[PDB]
């Protein structure tokens, strides 16, 4: 029986370095194992308890200091926690380095987790092989026996003997390689800096490269040869972002090398590794001419994310997974924070803003879970990998860093960085580096533990009565009894009174009610500047009709982030009931004079949730009258859009937003303009450039014709550009021919012309529009069994198939059906977070109709 009945390893033994030698042949999917672990005892144990899985071990056994002579112990194992224990020939006395050596058999993974391998086809013919690693969170132990926790850091020599052609890559630069007798090469890499078991990485496959030397460290993007041509932007961007993390962290990237790799597969594990960043082929390949704003915006942030992860996560790692949200939260913040100081032209705050919106309305559900609390098993380690925690974390740092200065934020960041580099940490340690705020401690970061420890976010009510600012707080709950919900809240607020002179100020509300005194007597006040604070603000009734009046006068007295914030808020409140729906729509009656994208898209987002909810109920006429009045507010901006790619990113994303609003709903010249552009494009065997900005729109309109449908289907199964094939798939699923809509899903499910990864994106698209709406949900239930086979229950795709099939229902008849269907298979499924959040969204719609179907009749 085995000497350790816990899931965490013992504090008994500690690794100091790892030495690893491996023979995978990619052709037969098998490999050599050999690990030498230079450990060290800190307390007496008869065993070394450590992690190992899937290893068929031949010979293993144990040294001391003292002797280069080695002596035979035998392994005991325990597969339930992945652990193995070596029964030591003699007592590990405290303070002594011993070294441990393991030989093993193993299989190369055929999933895409751990040490995995796959095949792909060439431009010229050919069957190529390839293998890589993906060790988060607990996968390293599958490749090689080790202390697989993030606290147990160490140093690494990895050496991999690989056939002549393949380029072997790994963390540290390749020190040496030496020809072996059969035709095989032996690659050895430098010993690694101190780093965590999960960050180890190594690649075997036929690539080329493209390099540049920022200062001392040299940056290179590795891709399969085909077109290493288009890693040119990736390369140039890693470069400026590299000496953008730079100086700001005031720490220098410790490695001599930094290599990014475009792995040639769609299920590629893309991750953080030090000196060996992975990506899916798709997310890196970019082309100045044929590729849109979306895929630059996306490739720029994807780089900027895994780059800050260098400092955050690798350099300074978690004690344990209970704090993952911190790094991924911080990285996600940097991703949006670097960009708007190097690439201020992308308007990457807009992405950010909307990202925060969608964060809050799922942080407002009751399915929500506060981001920090004890983890103890691994369904609890991978439950932490939902990007809701990441984005919320991200939101907190922007709120923390605009309350404290950006400078104050920086040094406390920098001060955080220096104090425990190469070390493991817990959450509160960052809050302490901050409490070296001020000359040294003027307020505590007990503040941040109110946000971390409680689900949801405060609703801040503001009333104002001639002197004043009466500020009160409660949890934003979506209705039908606990109150130790209290937040420490930075209250940015901006006003205007006297002379058109904008006064803005900060103040931290740390009790249930409070009050701030303004200097002048204003006509309007706005709370939460640029939505810097993660919360919703509700006003008393002629404080709301102050701002709206003010928006019809001169709205540009506010930012576009503020304006977008009111539109967000006023609509979500009128959902919760705290405002009539008709004063949301009088807020956006402003929009005749709007020119910034951020508020227009957010209003268009809102109005079209309303459009679709109505449309799925029978109330089609109400729905249609709704959009045409949005259309009329935005009528000039719509026509003045040119069907082009010309302009600032912001004004391009606006252009693409306005143009397929007007087209989705057939409003004005727009559908025709588009359908000429489609015939020209289709005339030309595809051989004509569509402005990528109007490309998804042009495709939709054409997908509405059996001629057009069948063309675009040929272009899907033929053309190479995976970017444009999702704007084609989209269209194919924006048909209203039900038989096709079914056949798309039926086929994506069977992996026929569309790989099964895309079905979740198909299903969401079919069901979102009236003709497919019931068809989607029925597909989801008619093949539920085969849906659980290829997406493991609770995974982020069975996620969406239920979210995106059902989130539009609004009748208690439907509600019953959804719940009757899910309980009717399993109760273990029936109380999945995904499933009763699915159910939770549906009554919120019923509630929404119950309060706002309304009287849509007397207006609208
Ligand atoms: C995996 O096993 C195969 C088969 O033993 C090894 O194969 C050879 O591949 C080279 C080219 O890469 C050919 O020139 C040889 O003729 C092949 N030999 C045979 C017997 O098929 C392969 O090298 C092994 N992989 C590794 C990494 O050692
Ligand atoms: C990536 O390709 C580049 C060519 O664009 C290689 O660059 C030179 O590589 C040789 C080979 O070691 C060096 O001796 C030269 O010093 C490099 N050029 C300069 C200006 O320094 C690069 O080596 C390739 N990547 C790898 C890993 O070899
Ligand atoms: C783990 C640790 O040392 N924490 C302390 C913290 O308790 C203290 O308040 C702070 C003051 O700067 O210094 C640090
Ligand atoms: C691996 O395969 C089995 C154990 O599952 C055993 O018969 C065989 O000898 C093992 N190979 C080595 C090299 O230990
Ligand atoms: C080896 O052990 C000694 C004490 O036994 C310790 O002082 C030393 O640091 C260890 N070696 C390394 C490289 O740390
Ligand atoms: C690889 O998988 C086979 C089953 O397909 C198993 O018998 C074998 O033991 C595995 N290899 C190791 C090292 O466990
Ligand atoms: C290059 O050299 C060192 C990096 O170690 C740094 O002090 C210096 O500022 C760097 N300069 C630039 C332009 O990156
Ligand atoms: C170092 O960490 C300790 C926690 O023991 C903390 O109190 C201290 O403020 C940190 N110092 C810096 C400069 O971050
Ligand atoms: C607000 O004004 C009153 C005096 O009119 C003062 O007593 C109170 O402390 C002020 N509050 C703040 C937060 O400045
Ligand atoms: C948008 O608002 C008005 C134009 O109606 C103008 O004052 C303002 O500068 C415009 N901003 C941009 C970026 O065009
Ligand atoms: C259209 O182009 C494809 C290559 O992308 C080619 O295979 C096909 O035969 C062409 N069609 C015609 C009618 O020439
Ligand atoms: Zn990340």
Short mmCIF file of C-alpha atoms and ligand atoms in Angstrom, two decimals, residues 56-58 103 105, ligand 4:
data_model
loop_
_atom_site.label_atom_id
_atom_site.label_comp_id
_atom_site.label_asym_id
_atom_site.label_seq_id
_atom_site.Cartn_x
_atom_site.Cartn_y
_atom_site.Cartn_z
CA UNK A 56 5.93 1.66 -18.22
CA UNK A 57 9.09 1.77 -16.16
CA UNK A 58 11.93 -0.76 -16.76
CA UNK A 103 13.97 5.16 -17.18
CA UNK A 105 8.36 3.47 -21.74
C1 LIG B 4 6.54 -2.29 -21.49
O1 LIG B 4 5.42 -3.17 -21.87
C2 LIG B 4 5.05 -4.19 -20.92
C3 LIG B 4 4.47 -3.50 -19.70
O2 LIG B 4 3.16 -3.01 -19.96
C4 LIG B 4 6.24 -5.10 -20.61
O3 LIG B 4 5.94 -6.42 -21.04
C5 LIG B 4 7.48 -4.60 -21.34
O4 LIG B 4 8.62 -5.37 -20.99
C6 LIG B 4 7.73 -3.13 -21.02
N1 LIG B 4 8.94 -2.70 -21.69
C7 LIG B 4 10.03 -2.29 -21.03
C8 LIG B 4 11.19 -1.89 -21.89
O5 LIG B 4 10.06 -2.23 -19.80
#
